[PDB]
Write a protein that binds this ligand. Structure first.
Ligand SMILES: O=c1ccn([C@@H]2O[C@H](COP(=O)(O)OP(=O)(O)O[C@H]3O[C@H](CO)[C@@H](O)[C@H](O)[C@H]3O)[C@@H](O)[C@H]2O)c(=O)[nH]1
Ligand SMILES: O=c1ccn([C@@H]2O[C@H](COP(=O)(O)OP(=O)(O)O[C@H]3O[C@H](CO)[C@@H](O)[C@H](O)[C@H]3O)[C@@H](O)[C@H]2O)c(=O)[nH]1
Ligand SMILES: O=c1ccn([C@@H]2O[C@H](COP(=O)(O)OP(=O)(O)O[C@H]3O[C@H](CO)[C@@H](O)[C@H](O)[C@H]3O)[C@@H](O)[C@H]2O)c(=O)[nH]1
Lengths: 41, 1861
């Protein structure tokens, strides 16, 4: 106890690195939608 | 159960007997272990292995590793093994190991004893025991008996075998541990790489280390039971173990043994070593050896003293060895020979006297009747004994003749007609003779065995038909020192109380020309009354043990006035006639009573102190028939026997307060050496006669006859030696009689003159063959004559040498004779350098040669500068001694010495002038000697002055003043915590910060230290006499009205109720300490009660100390008011005027009352001014000044009251003091330690238990503890024997250039508590060790940087019901206890206590402590802690706020001893029992003991674990828990987590391994740029963002730099409020103003987790949140549904700081926060608009949000403290919010949080590393990340869930931590 947990943590450590600096690609806003015909409501 | 040990099953009991019996006739065969080896080589290998794997164990086990249970036995008990490896190889030279026979077991030559001992450990459980081994010895001796010496060395060989087995086990366990760690490394490497080809390579590489059983135990378990497992390593390992017929179950059972067996064997070895060490062997040897069976019948050998029994055994062994005969038949023949010699004895009607043929005068007859071959050395000794005194003088004369021949041949080139050379050589060769005698003494000591006498062993005291009178010959010209004389008599009686012994004092007052002054009788009357009082104190069985005799001063001739018949010789003769009955003696009526028989008289002396049980040993030796004089009928000479005994006398170290450097010059060997028993005497080992100096016991009949029949008249001080000429004086050289050495040089000159006066009237006794004198006696007088004439001969030889020629070459001459003196003492040191012809290899025994080299140089210098004075004194002495009875005639200054001597300078100048005229070349050598000689009185006065001692120190006055004022400040504890509330006892503990409470527990040590502190304070002049007596009354009444167990105390007691807290456990040490303190207090009470006249004035010094205290405290007044400081300089002028007035008063020696009245007026005026300035300045510090002035004016009032005593009606006071003295002494002596004595291992039990009436298990075995003080009482009371003192402790450890006493947990109080009470001496080992301890403590403090003071204290750590705890501390260098360097706790009181040896350094350390906040209202605090693990923020050290009673008492005692030159050590020693037991002290420092063997100190201290994550984005996630006892929260490395309060949670959180986006979040948005990101690193994470995360205890830190900006987040949990806080701090770098906005996000969910996770919409709907007036706190709480929900109102606030007053921005609608189609990773709230329209109410998706725009300036920092609160109801959230709405408020709660986290940490046995490991376990226990779960194949056919309910496990909300034992 208190030695197995440390040993397991080091053995279970170490490609997902370039995905951190990309941040978020803002957001998308559309120009509404065309209200075509042929619809009851 | 095998390993590499020596195991031979187990024989239990009654099988050992017949086993050894079979071994006797049929042995050898085979042994469990055993092989051919060399004993010395094997022992060296064992020692090397122990050092190797002890250094290995030291360098390991501290870096962090598992330790087997068989390893810590070698670690913690290394002193036992390092002492056990000794003795062996020290008791076995190359001769003792060869003379014993051998059994040749197995073909190899094997001695019998260790062959037998081999099976003792083999056939048993490796545990030694007396009964089993005695049974084995008896069984072996059933057929063939053992021999003397063979039976002796059983423990040694047993220890050798035991340490060999220990080495085997140690190396085996080291190898097993190394294999285990290697297997762990290999399996970790295998599991790290998923490939399979490399696994085969690794297996084929490690195949060389698989056959060992201790490699697959961890390996196979790790493969089978792990996380990832394998399928290829097992396929190889199982096949390999199945091959070679080994399988796997055998391996899996192998580790079940060989480890528990190892632990059991190691523990058994340790216990066996302890049992061998502590248990005795003399009684075992007596009860086991078959030789003693023969000699325990028909003879008194069973009671003949242990040493004489040893001599008998040694003689028997020597006779049996050389002579071809067995020892049993030799003993039988000796017994028959003794029987055939007739009884011839009064008391010897029964038994048989056996010594007459063994050590008697029939040794030669037995050796010739048995066929013994004497040794060549024995032949030489016998021949030279037959050659009488001629053989004594032959080497001396031969060496002198060689010396004169050599000097004559060397000085054969001088000229002159050769008429002076012969006389010159004859008068010169005195120092050559002295050197020859010294060389002869050295040779005989090195070769000739010292002679020891034989005597009885009076275990029951002196029996009937043996009565001894101890008579001290002195005078009663003592108006006051008659009390000293009776005290000396009482001490002498207390030395040897048991037996039929009586004590008498004989007197003859001064020397007056008349007969009687007709007044001395009344002067005697007081004496005859005083002794009568002593009789009332000692009258047992109607027996009077005290007598007085007085002479009548009959006129004889002249000069000496009227001495009766003669001097003290005549007095002793008159006593001799009186004892046998003489009615007409020249004595006085009334005081002429003799106690009947008393056939034996002891003389002793005035200043000599009688050693414990000394004369009792002398009485037996005298009474033994061998040592009984027979009175030769032809002449009163006594051919054989001894009528005079003289024990050796060695000077004491010091003489109390009189200890000058002159003492440490003319006497080096000072004290008693327990190691040595017999000192080789040339005159006794070769001639069997000694010189009687007048201090010894003697008979009456033979002594009286031989003294009366030969002496006519003319006897002087030398007659004592003449007595040896008429008897046979034997030097015992076995019993010590200490004697003080005078310090003044004048006293030494007077004593030398007196000794030399008597040595020159014996010339008729030498030159005349008539009268009667021993043949060697003439040689004794010749030796005395030459020893007296040496200085005159030296002076004459030197002056004539530079008078005749002295051209050049005689210069070399003045170099040679001065070398001769150098020969005289240094040859003695030759006995200390020869290692007995390098028989063995010594250990680190040091050299210390410089000390005695410097001592010899100083002695030679003093001798050469006093040559002229000694020559003048001897010349005048011999002239007087011849002019009388040969011509028929019959303190101060340097000016005093000059006028007294007036001889050496004038004579030296005359000689120099007379010699320098002829030749005119003899001045170049004469001038230095003459100038050195004329200055002799100057160096004489310089050396006669007393130097600095253990009591008197050069402390100047400023240091003393500072110590006195510190003590006065400290005494506030006793002043304010002793009350007449039925307590009268100081509380043990006092808190002052954490709501201070007064403790209600008191210990006897506390009572004693309080009592002695009261005595010291009264001596200081701080309180009135009446107050002191009242306090003594209260303390004594409380003590007597207290529960006791056979006088003892139950340690802890209540104060208000005076009951026992817990079990009534008696403490042995505390009772002894209290008894010693009570003894000292009673002695002091008697001291001021015998004359209560001058003690009533007062010291008149304490008021000056408190005035100085006021002066110092006034400098701390912050006088910076609007009206300047007028009152300040008013007050200072008043105080300096008061100081001047008191200085003038104390300058006056008449002590005018009007002066002290005016002083009181000034004091009260100063108090009024202080009150005036205080009530105007509302400060918390001026109250201290005002109360100090008030206490000052009570002190002045008390001094006035003590100055107003009537001094007339003092009898009630005197009788009260007498009654208190008697009651205190009776209470102290009512102690009973006898029932606490363990008569199995000696020593003392730790305590007694009132439950089952059982003793404690442990004992005290160290001479470096306070128990020593108790031991003194244990000997003072007389309830313990003397060997108990010598059978414990006395261990030395190397450090520096010397060795120090080893102490368990080596703090300073172990070395300071004893000397605080009784008196030590400079020459003792105790004072030297204390000085060392101080020096090394300062060195350790310097190395650690922090000031020293490591002692008993309270480490800065709390617990429930705050008490700061209490434990022991020490230094690892001198502690013998692992775990001392990890604390580094500094206690200021240790510096005060260690002030008796270095006041300046102690004061400097105290000032260094004063530079920090180590001072409080009640003087100094408890201690200060420097341990990083117990220090908050960036502070360097933390001061523990405790006050202790015993610490303050120790400080007061130490300062009183320093200021008053150890007054306590004197008053404690003012009891006769203390002087009786003091000779057990004194001892002798050794400098030759077998010393043992041993920036790292800075790193040795415990350091807290700082878990820091470099980049919490690409590494594995890290989590941390925070708790408040009722409120818990989760913080992840990315900033996620939750918040739980009493089961139910607050913030929603789900365990998503891939998302991890739940919790309270902080967002930072730029205004101009429009960019936004997060304070943590998860949702946004813009480019750059150099971030880091710190998870330490209590607080959590998230730091992030984005370039030009640094943002830090501090997450904390509140104390006693159930709140959480987040400090966001933004600091700029560039010089540009920037706009930023903060946002807080958290979703409130008040539910028990499952309820929200089941149907979230209910939890969303049942939330009512709103914003109140002055909007910055948003509150929320569930709407009331039923009558059973709590409600748990929560709230969130921003608490803006470092900014203007601006409105907040809130939004409680997540629909308008997210954007209906987005996530937290991209929210619509950070767009260009829709900025928190502030909608509140019953929102379907309630959240808590707070926005504030903050303008961070250029260069500085801005912080905002977000807070969240949860409370059971709404009526109490207001006080929590207002508690945090106050500015700052981040401190105060922070330190409280740290303290409570420490409380929680220490409430369980958890370490910081253990806490980190537990959090790492929790990260897997909570998150469904399973990196340590079961195997994939194992988990693929199990986990049916419903089956877990059979074990009564809920398995609903349970991570289920499994563990397999
Ligand atoms: O009553 C006395 C005491 C001392 N002395 C002489 O004084 C000298 C000093 O000896 P001291 O030690 O005083 O004598 P005690 O043995 O004490 O007698 C010696 O020469 C003594 O003979 C006397 O003549 N008469
Ligand atoms: O303070 C002291 C103590 C002792 N002596 C001795 O007194 C003697 C000097 O006296 P001196 O001038 O010789 O005359 P007396 O007094 O006749 O001589 C005696 O002086 C002492 C008797 O009182 C003893 O020492 C001796 O019996 C003897 O010398 C010397 O022996 C000194 O040691 C002093 O002078 N001063
Ligand atoms: O200032 C002086 C003068 C003399 N003496 C002593 O007095 C004696 C001198 O007398 P002296 O005529 O030289 O006779 P001595 O042959 O020395 O014999 C003396 O011895 C006794 C012991 O002091 C003296 O008292 C007697 O006068 C005398 O018999 C010597 O002992 C000197 O030590 C002093 O101590 N101090």
């Amino acid at each position: 106890i208190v030695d197995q947990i440390n040993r397991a943590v080091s053995l279970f450590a170490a490609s997902d690195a370039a995905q951190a600096r990309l941040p978020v690609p803002a957001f998308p806003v559309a120009e509404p939608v065309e209200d075509a015909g042929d619809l009851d409501f | 159960d095998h390993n590499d040990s020596i195991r031979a099953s187990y024989m239990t009991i009654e099988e050992l007997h017949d086993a050894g019996a079979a071994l006797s006739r049929d042995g050898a065969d085979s042994l469990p272990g055993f092989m051919e080896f060399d004993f010395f080589e094997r022992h060296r290998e064992n020692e090397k292995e122990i050092l190797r794997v002890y250094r290995t164990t030291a360098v390991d086990a501290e870096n962090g590793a598992t330790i087997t249970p068989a390893a810590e036995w070698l670690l913690d008990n290394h002193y036992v093994i390092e002492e056990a490896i000794q003795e062996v190889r020290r008791d076995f030279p190359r001769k003792f190991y060869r003379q014993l026979p051998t059994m040749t077991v197995g073909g190899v030559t094997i001695p019998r004893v260790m062959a037998l001992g081999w099976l003792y450990v083999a056939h048993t459980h490796s545990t030694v025991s007396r009964e089993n081994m005695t049974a084995l010895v008896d069984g072996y001796q059933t057929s063939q008996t053992l021999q003397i010496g063979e039976l002796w060395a059983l423990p040694s060989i047993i220890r050798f075998v035991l340490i060999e087995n220990l080495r085997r086990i140690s190396i085996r366990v080291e190898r097993s541990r190394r294999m285990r760690q290697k297997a762990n490394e290999v399996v970790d490497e295998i599991i790290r790489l998923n490939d399979a080809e490399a696994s085969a390579a690794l297996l084929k590489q490690v195949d060389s280390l698989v056959d060992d059983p201790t490699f697959a135990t961890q390996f196979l378990y790790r493969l089978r039971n792990g996380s990832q497992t394998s399928g290829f390593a097992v396929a190889w390992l199982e096949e390999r173990l199945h091959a070679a017929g080994t399988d796997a179950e055998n391996v899996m059972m192998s580790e079940h043994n060989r480890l528990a067996s190892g632990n059991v064997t190691m523990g058994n070895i340790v216990k066996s070593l302890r049992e061998i060490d502590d248990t005795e062997w003399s009684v075992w040897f007596e009860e086991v050896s078959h030789i003693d069976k023969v000699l325990r019948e028909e003879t008194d050998y069973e009671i003949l003293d242990f040493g004489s029994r040893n001599t008998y055994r040694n003689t028997i062994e020597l006779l049996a060895r050389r002579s071809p005969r067995t020892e049993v038949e030799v003993a039988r023949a000796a017994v028959e020979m003794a029987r055939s010699d007739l009884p011839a004895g009064a008391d010897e009607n029964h038994r048989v006297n056996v010594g007459s043929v063994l050590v008697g005068q029939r040794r030669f007859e037995l050796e010739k009747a048995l066929g013994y071959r004497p040794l060549a050395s024995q032949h030489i000794v016998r021949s030279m004994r037959k050659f009488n005194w001629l053989a004594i003088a032959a080497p001396v004369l031969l060496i002198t003749a060689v010396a004169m021949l050599a000097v004559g041949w060397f000085l054969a080139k001088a000229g002159m007609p050769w008429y002076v050379v012969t006389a010159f050589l004859l008068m010169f060769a005195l120092p050559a003779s002295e050197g020859a005698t010294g060389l002869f003494n050295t040779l005989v000591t090195f070769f000739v065995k010292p002679f020891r006498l034989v005597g009885y062993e009076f275990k029951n005291g002196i029996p009937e038909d043996a009565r001894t009178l101890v008579a001290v010959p002195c005078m009663l010209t003592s108006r006051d020192s008659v009390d000293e004389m009776m005290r000396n008599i009482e001490v002498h009686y207390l030395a040897n109380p048991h037996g039929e012994i009586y004590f008498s004092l004989v007197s003859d007052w001064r020397d007056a020309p008349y007969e009687q002054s007709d007044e001395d009788l009344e002067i005697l009357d007081y004496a005859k009354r005083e002794l009568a009082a002593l009789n009332s104190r000692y009258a047992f069985d109607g027996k009077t043990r005290f007598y007085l005799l007085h002479r009548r001063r009959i006129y004889n001739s002249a000069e000496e006035c009227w001495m009766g018949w003669e001097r003290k010789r005549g007095k002793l003769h008159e006593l001799n006639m009186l004892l046998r009955g003489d009615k007409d003696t020249t004595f006085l009526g009334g005081s002429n009573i003799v106690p009947a028989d008393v056939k034996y008289v002891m003389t002793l002396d005035a200043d000599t102190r009688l050693m414990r049980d000394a004369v009792t040993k002398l009485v037996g030796k005298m009474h033994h028939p061998i040592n009984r004089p027979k009175i030769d009928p032809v002449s009163g000479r006594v051919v054989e026997g001894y009528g005079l005994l003289q024990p050796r006398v060695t000077p004491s170290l010091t003489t109390g307060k009189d200890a000058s450097v002159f003492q440490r010059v003319f006497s080096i060997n000072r004290g008693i050496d327990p190691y040595v028993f017999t000192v080789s005497d040339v005159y006794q080992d070769l001639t069997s006669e000694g010189t009687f100096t007048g201090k010894g016991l003697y008979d009456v009949d033979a002594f009286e006859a031989a003294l009366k029949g030969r002496i006519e008249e003319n006897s002087i001080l030398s007659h004592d030696l003449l007595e040896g000429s008429f008897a046979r004086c034997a030097l015992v050289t076995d019993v010590e009689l200490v004697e003080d050495f005078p310090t003044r040089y004048e006293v030494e000159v007077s004593r030398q003159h007196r000794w030399a006066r008597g040595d020159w009237q014996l010339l008729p006794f030498i030159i005349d063959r008539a009268r009667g004198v021993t043949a060697i006696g003439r040689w004794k007088m010749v030796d005395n004559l030459r020893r007296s004439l040496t200085p005159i001969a030296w002076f004459f030889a030197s002056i004539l040498g530079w008078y005749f020629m002295d051209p050049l070459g005689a210069l070399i001459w003045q170099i040679l004779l001065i070398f001769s003196l150098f020969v005289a003492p240094t040859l003695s040191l030759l006995s200390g350098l020869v290692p007995r012809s390098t028989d063995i290899v010594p250990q680190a025994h040091f050299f210390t040669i410089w000390s005695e080299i410097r001592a010899t140089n100083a002695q030679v210098a003093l001798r050469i500068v006093f040559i002229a004075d000694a020559a003048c004194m001897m010349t005048d002495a011999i002239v007087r001694s011849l002019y009388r009875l040969l011509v028929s005639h019959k303190q101060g200054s340097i000016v005093d010495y000059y006028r007294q001597m007036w001889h050496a300078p004038v004579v030296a100048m005359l000689g120099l002038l007379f010699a320098a005229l002829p030749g005119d070349n003899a001045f170049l050598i004469g001038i230095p000697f003459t100038l050195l000689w004329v200055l002799s009185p100057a160096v004489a006065w310089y050396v006669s002055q007393s130097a600095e001692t253990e009591d008197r120190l050069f402390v100047s006055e400023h240091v003393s003043f500072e110590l006195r004022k510190i003590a006065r400040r400290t005494w506030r504890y006793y002043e304010a915590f002793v009350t007449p509330q039925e307590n009268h006892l100081p509380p043990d503990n006092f808190q002052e910060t954490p709501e201070p409470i007064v403790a209600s527990r008191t210990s006897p040590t506390n009572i004693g230290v309080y009592l002695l502190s009261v005595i010291s304070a009264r001596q200081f002049g701080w309180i009135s006499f009446a107050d002191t007596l009242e306090r003594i009354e209260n303390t004594i009444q409380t003590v007597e009205k207290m529960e006791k167990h056979r006088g003892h105390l139950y340690n802890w007691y209540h104060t208000d109720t005076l009951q026992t807290l817990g079990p009534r456990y008696v403490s042995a040490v505390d009772s002894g300490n209290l008894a010693g303190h009570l003894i000292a207090v009673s002695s002091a009470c008697r001291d001021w009660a015998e004359a209560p006249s001058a003690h009533l004035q007062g010291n008149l010094d304490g008021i000056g100390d408190v005035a100085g205290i006021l002066r110092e405290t006034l400098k701390a007044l912050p006088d910076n008011r609007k009206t300047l400081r007028p009152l300040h300089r008013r007050l200072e002028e008043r105080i300096i005027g008061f100081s001047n007035a008191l200085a003038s008063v104390k300058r006056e020696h008449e002590f005018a009352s009007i002066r002290v009245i005016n002083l009181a007026v000034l004091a009260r005026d100063i108090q009024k001014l202080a009150t005036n300035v205080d009530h105007e300045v509302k400060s918390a510090q001026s109250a201290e000044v005002t109360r100090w002035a008030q206490l000052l004016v009570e002190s002045c009032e008390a001094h006035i009251s003590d100055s107003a005593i009537d001094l007339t009606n003092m009898e009630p006071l005197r009788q009260r003091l007498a009654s208190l003295r008697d009651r205190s002494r009776n209470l102290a002596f009512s102690m009973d330690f006898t029932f606490l004595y363990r008569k199995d291992r000696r020593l003392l039990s730790i305590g007694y238990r009132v439950e089952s009436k059982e003793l404690d298990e442990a004992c005290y075995d160290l001479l470096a503890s306070e128990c020593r003080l108790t031991s003194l009482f244990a000997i003072a009371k007389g309830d313990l024997p003397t060997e108990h003192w010598y059978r414990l402790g006395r261990q030395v450890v190397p450090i520096g250039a010397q060795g120090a006493l080893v102490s368990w947990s080596g703090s300073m109080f172990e070395y300071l508590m004893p000397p605080l009470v009784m008196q030590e001496r400079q020459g003792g080992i105790l004072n030297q060790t204390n000085n060392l301890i101080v020096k090394e403590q300062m060195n350790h403090g310097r190395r650690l940087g922090t000031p020293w003071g490591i002692s008993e204290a309270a480490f800065n750590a709390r617990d429930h019901n705050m008490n700061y705890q209490y434990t022991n501390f020490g230094v690892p260098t001198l502690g013998l206890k692992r775990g001392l360097g990890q604390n580094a706790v500094i206690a200021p009181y240790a510096s005060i206590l260690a002030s008796q040896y270095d006041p300046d350094g102690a004061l400097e350390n105290l000032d260094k402590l004063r530079k920090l906040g180590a001072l409080g209202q009640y003087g100094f605090h408890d201690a200060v802690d420097f341990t990083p693990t117990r220090v908050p923020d960036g502070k360097v050290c933390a001061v523990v706020y405790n006050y202790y009673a015993h610490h303050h008492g120790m400080s007061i005692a130490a300062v009183a001893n320093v200021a008053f030159d150890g007054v306590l050590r004197e008053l404690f020693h003012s009891d006769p029992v203390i002087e009786a037991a003091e000779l057990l002290l004194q001892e002798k420092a050794p400098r030759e003991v077998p010393v043992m063997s041993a920036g790292k100190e800075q790193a040795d201290l415990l350091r807290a674990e700082v878990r820091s994550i470099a980049d919490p984005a690409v590494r594995d996630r890290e989590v941390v828990f925070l708790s408040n006892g009722h409120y818990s929260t989760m913080l992840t490395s990315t900033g996620a987590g939750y918040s739980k309060w009493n089961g139910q949670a607050i913030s929603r959180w789900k365990a998503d391994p891939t998302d991890d986006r739940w919790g309270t979040f902080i967002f930072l948005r730029d205004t101009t740029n429009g960019q936004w990101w997060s304070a943590t690193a998860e949702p946004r994470v813009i480019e750059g963002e150099k971030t880091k995360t710190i998870f330490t205890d209590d607080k959590a830190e998230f730091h992030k730099t984005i370039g030009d900006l640094q943002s830090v987040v501090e997450c904390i949990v509140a104390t006693e409020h159930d709140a959480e806080g987040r400090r966001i701090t933004l600091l700029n770098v560039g010089s540009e103003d920037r706009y930023i906005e903060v946002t807080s996000y958290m979703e409130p969910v008040i539910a028990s987790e499952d309820d929200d996770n089941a149907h979230p919409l209910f939890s969303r709907m049942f939330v009512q949140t709103e914003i109140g007036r002055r909007g910055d706190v948003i509150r929320a709480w569930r709407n009331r549904r039923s009558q059973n929900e709590p409600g748990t109102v929560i709230a969130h606030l921003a608490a803006d700081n470092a900014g203007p007053s601006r409105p907040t921005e809130f939004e409680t609608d997540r629909a308008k926060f997210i954007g209906r189609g987005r996530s937290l990773r991209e929210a619509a709230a950070f767009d260009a608009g829709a900025t928190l329209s502030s909608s509140d109410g019953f929102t379907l998706d309630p959240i808590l949000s707070l926005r504030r725009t903050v303008r961070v300036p250029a260069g500085k920092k801005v912080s905002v403290i977000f807070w969240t609160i949860a409370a059971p109801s709404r009526e109490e959230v207001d006080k929590a919010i207002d508690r945090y709405r106050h500015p700052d408020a981040f401190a105060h709660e922070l330190v409280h949080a740290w303290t409570r986290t420490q409380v929680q940490m220490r409430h369980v046995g958890v370490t910081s590393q253990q806490a980190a490991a537990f959090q790492h376990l929790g990260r897997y226990l909570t998150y469904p990340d399973m990196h340590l779960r079961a195997d994939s194949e194992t988990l693929k056919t199990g986990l049916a869930s419903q089956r877990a309910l059979w074990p009564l496990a809920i398995s609903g909300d349970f991570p289920i931590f499994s563990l397999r034992i």
